Design a protein around this nucleic acid. Sequence first.
RNA 1: UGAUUAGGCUAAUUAUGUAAUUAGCCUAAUCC
Lengths: 505, 131
Amino acid sequence: SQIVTGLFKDCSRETSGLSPAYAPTYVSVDDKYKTSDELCVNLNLPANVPYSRVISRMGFKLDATVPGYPKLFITREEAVRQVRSWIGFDVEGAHASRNACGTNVPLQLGFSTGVNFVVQPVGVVDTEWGNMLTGIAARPPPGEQFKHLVPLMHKGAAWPIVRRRIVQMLSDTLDKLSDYCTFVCWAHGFALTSASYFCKIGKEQKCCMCNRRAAAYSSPLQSYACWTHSCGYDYVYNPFFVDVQQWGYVGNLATNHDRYCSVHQGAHVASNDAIMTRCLAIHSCFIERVDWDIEYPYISHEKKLNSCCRIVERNVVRAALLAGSFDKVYDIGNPKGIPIVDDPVVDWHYFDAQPLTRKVQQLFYTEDMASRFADGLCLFWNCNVPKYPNNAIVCRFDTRVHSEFNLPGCDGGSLYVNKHAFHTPAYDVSAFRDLKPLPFFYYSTTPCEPLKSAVCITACNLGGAVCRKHATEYREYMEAYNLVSASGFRLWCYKTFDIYNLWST
Amino acid sequence: AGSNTEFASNSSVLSLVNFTVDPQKAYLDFVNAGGAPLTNCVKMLTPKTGTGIAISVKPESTADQETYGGASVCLYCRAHIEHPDVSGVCKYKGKFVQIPAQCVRDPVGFCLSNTPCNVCQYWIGYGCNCD
RNA sequence: UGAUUAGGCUAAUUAUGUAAUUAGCCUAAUCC
Ligand SMILES: [Mg+2]
Ligand SMILES: [Zn+2]
Ligand SMILES: [Zn+2]
Ligand SMILES: [Zn+2]
Ligand SMILES: [Zn+2]
Ligand SMILES: [Zn+2]
């Protein structure tokens, strides 16, 4: 109506507006043509020679709610549900100069994958026959903060090449994780302005070669494809956008990120801002808040890994409990209070931070009960504690191993996604200074009814023989243990654990 | 620095047109869904004694038409995107467009939905007698 | 003499002492 916007601002240095036949809007018409009734007059005043006027792309607003068109600025919940698609995104800027003044163009685009792309300064120019998306004169921002951007003004590549490089990098990153791309941004204004150069939107589409959702668009082919079929595609189709600053943060990105993380330091580059942005988003969604009502789908062998974890756990706990003749067990981290193994009869006590059964206590662990819990063993199966006691059996995920179900996290930790999202602190061997790694072995007591192993604890192996019933069982246990170990789980036992104490049975 | 061009009320649909694969379908779906048509076009004061053709170098509106600036009724000029023509040259810019009086509620969308005749240069169905 | 937001001052227009919009300047925050 009457409130003007900075979008499509005429950044030219001309002192006068355009004629009615050439001006795109009534506001942009020169005042010598206007009348009182909001009308223009076709004066005989001479038409101008060919002109070039730089148009600003600053101030996009994707708030339209057209039916059939998906909502691209998703809320916090939808961002949490799409955590496998999170890509950090930051763009460095350059100021238009010489013939123009009043707009910024992307210079360096950085992503949380650790990749930076340097582009030539390209903007929109209105002429007397139409529009162009062409190179314009640009200047690096002044000040000591942006001194690293000065040499980059001569190292830029063409935008069509950078588009295909971005599509290829996103394909490589997100092929086995999700069908979606979610750009996590700190200030979405300039990020959206830059995304206008390489993203296309529209109705949701199907890949032309398979049944997956299409995430890339090919202008030369005018086709849609998913991540594995996007070779040579030059646009990102229907990406999501997330603004972390709108999530209730005060100050700049650096001071907000440094309050909770001290791992993502480095020189000032765009990929560093993107990594810090994604880290801050992860901390905001999965450390400050716990939305365990959200269940994530299965990408890979997660049901099999979940099955093998219990197979490893039962044997490990049984063998630990038999060796040493112990009678008491403290199961830290059991919300339900369900015992794991019950063939050696011992007394069981259950602890958890948020128990769901009155048979389970409400204890938080802070190392102070090392002497208190020393009469029996403590169990730390997938319970993260910065210092474990000597008489304990621990299973901890190694966050330095990257997989489909283990995403980068905050402060060296990682996001483990298996039916739920758990943030795990960084793996540190100093927490196991009182413990030793658990050796591989198999112990079973099922009655009996080639393979030769020195760790197969079996009554037949005492006699220098083996039976098939135990041989195939050892093979499946080997497969389960190898899957558990390859997935990233490490087992730690007390110092006095020896397999030779189990042969007395 | 610079001079403003557009109202805030128009900033939503134009932004969509800057991102969609098919801008014409995007604008038409926005309008038919109840969205507000584009405003702030260049309307011309004419004596209403014109020939009536679609596109002309001077205002040629008849008693049942209105004259608009061409660049103000082109969606690709309004959104500042590439024109879908040969060599990227707009057919509206630099000229005046005659819109029927019963369509002035949406001058841009009308230009997306109608084409002039190649013989008489009138709109088809709004002055074209080539039956 | 890069961008937006919020506040303050000035000028113009419009409406009916006061308000809205636009344009310029100052301050603060974020982005560059
Ligand atoms: Mg940055
Ligand atoms: Zn496909
Ligand atoms: Zn961090
Ligand atoms: Zn046997
Ligand atoms: Zn045009
Ligand atoms: Zn005809």
